Amino acid sequence: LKIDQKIRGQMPERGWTEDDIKNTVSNGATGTSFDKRSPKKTPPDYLGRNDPATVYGSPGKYVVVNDRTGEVTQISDKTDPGWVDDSRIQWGN
């Protein structure tokens, strides 16, 4: 797993600890998603992403990981009981 500066900064503000993420991921895949990010979404290299992704965890308490890069692309805000899951997430597969 790769955790960039952005995700690292979000962790303590969204209720996640280093262990929470590791444990959630070790529990196994619980769904799938996709990491589509246009070049402009990824400065300063601007490579973008067009990769399958895997979801770990459960509704409101999940992490999304890029299958190719191992990058954590999203972490839900566990402090928000009304967090609406990303529409691209498909649970089960």
């Binding site: 900064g9 503000e13 999203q74 009304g82």
Partner: protein, 106 residues
Amino acid sequence: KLFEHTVLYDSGDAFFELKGNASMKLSPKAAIEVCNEAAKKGLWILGIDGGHWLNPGFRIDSSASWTYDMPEEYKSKIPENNRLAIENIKDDIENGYTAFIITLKM
């Protein structure tokens, strides 16, 4: 949290007063205000998550996630970080996104 997750904040001041880093839901207007205040405060914008405000409720869209890792020598690059961040928000508005969550390096 010092703020409410059920509220779409419309002023950048709320982000700082209520410590909303990486979590507070911001209207497009508030998002731009936070970016401008960030620059004035010398803070690097690490990421912006775009999504839709469902009145109420925030639904994030990973394809709208903008990320800019902070380089070692970043201070002279804050103006560019700010410009790209705001350009990103305006582009998301063109694509129909109605709410944002901003992550600053604090």
